[PDB]
Amino acid sequence: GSVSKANVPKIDVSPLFGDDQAAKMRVAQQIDAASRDTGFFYAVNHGINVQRLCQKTKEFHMSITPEEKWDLAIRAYNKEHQDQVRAGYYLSIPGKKAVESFCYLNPNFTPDHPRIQAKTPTHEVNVWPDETKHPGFQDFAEQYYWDVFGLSSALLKGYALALGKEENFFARHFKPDDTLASVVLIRYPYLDPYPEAAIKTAADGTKLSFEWHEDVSLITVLYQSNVQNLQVETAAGYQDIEADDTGYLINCGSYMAHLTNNYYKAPIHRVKWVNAERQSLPFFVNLGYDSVIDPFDPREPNGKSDREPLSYGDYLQNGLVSLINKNGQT
Ligand SMILES: CC(C)[C@@H](NC(=O)[C@H](CS)NC(=O)CCC[C@H](N)C(=O)O)C(=O)O
Numbered sequence: 001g002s003v004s005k006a007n008v009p010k011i012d013v014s015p016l017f018g019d020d021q022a023a024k025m026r027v028a029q030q031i032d033a034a035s036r037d038t039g040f041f042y043a044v045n046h047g048i049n050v051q052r053l054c055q056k057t058k059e060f061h062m063s064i065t066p067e068e069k070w071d072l073a074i075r076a077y078n079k080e081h082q083d084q085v086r087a088g089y090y091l092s093i094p095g096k097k098a099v100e101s102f103c104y105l106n107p108n109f110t111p112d113h114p115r116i117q118a119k120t121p122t123h124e125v126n127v128w129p130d131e132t133k134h135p136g137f138q139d140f141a142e143q144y145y146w147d148v149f150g151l152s153s154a155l156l157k158g159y160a161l162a163l164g165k166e167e168n169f170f171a172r173h174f175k176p177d178d179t180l181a182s183v184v185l186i187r188y189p190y191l192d193p194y195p196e197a198a199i200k201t202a203a204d205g206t207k208l209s210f211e212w213h214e215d216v217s218l219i220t221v222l223y224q225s226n227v228q229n230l231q232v233e234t235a236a237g238y239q240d241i242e243a244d245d246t247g248y249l250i251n252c253g254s255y256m257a258h259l260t261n262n263y264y265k266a267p268i269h270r271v272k273w274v275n276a277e278r279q280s281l282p283f284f285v286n287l288g289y290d291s292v293i294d295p296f297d298p299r300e301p302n303g304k305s306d307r308e309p310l311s312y313g314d315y316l317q318n319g320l321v322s323l324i325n326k327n328g329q330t
């Protein structure tokens, strides 16, 4: 009845945009400490206009129509859209499934992009609603991709320094022309009555909207409304992550755990059921399809690892399928 608050420090990441190397190292230390503890931190002083993000996302969610949702739907909901595994609309099912969302990928994945031409898995051309019906939405959303890409680049410099590397150790694989990163614009609704079929129950009795998992990402860069919902598993049990709709919640995904030999673990976390209208807006920091980082271990004098190199595209395609199998099609 007294779930403890998780330690989730607020780290001023602004030095990671600049050229003060000592200041950057002090930020890197804070990232290291958070990554070794609960595995979460809030990035503050990140430079992104999150109120405007929330506003523009709200305008999209509260004006998309049922017709548009079918017309944008991913393959899981619309068999006519065989090319849409990742990008498009993820429908709710009233009475059964409350959440709904819209996912988009790299705006540079155009019809003439070489990976689109090659039909390489996990690369897709984004689908968008009609401009007249959603004026400004596509432009805003594409610009948001680049704003959060920029923040993520800076965060990756911090993680690299934290791990004893040069600052471009990760960021050199995180490029505008080929990143597999995605934005998801998630709506969690208020519903009265709320369908019990859309509520899961954890082993400890907690009511959930999304079960325990580790992220399929290098890092995850998340903005949410100010409604508490996330919990992180620690040695002391599940602990509540306090909401902060001015900051970005950051954690590592399982690709970071792999390449650090679990020195930076991918924290296990879950989403509590809350009957409230809220937004959840993750950016999944994914590398390029052929990106391979040689695994290492910063706990060992020679840094040698017992893990094999894994290309990012292989990791991602299989990880996304496995997460659907484990925790359901969202
Ligand atoms: C905890 C939040 C990040 C959010 N959960 C999520 O977004 C969950 C768990 S990290 N993520 C996923 O299902 C993976 C979506 C990947 C996306 N379709 C893509 O093709 O790249 C939630 O609010 O439920």
Ligand SMILES: [Fe+3]
Binding pocket: 213, 214, 215, 269
């Ligand atoms: Fe997650």
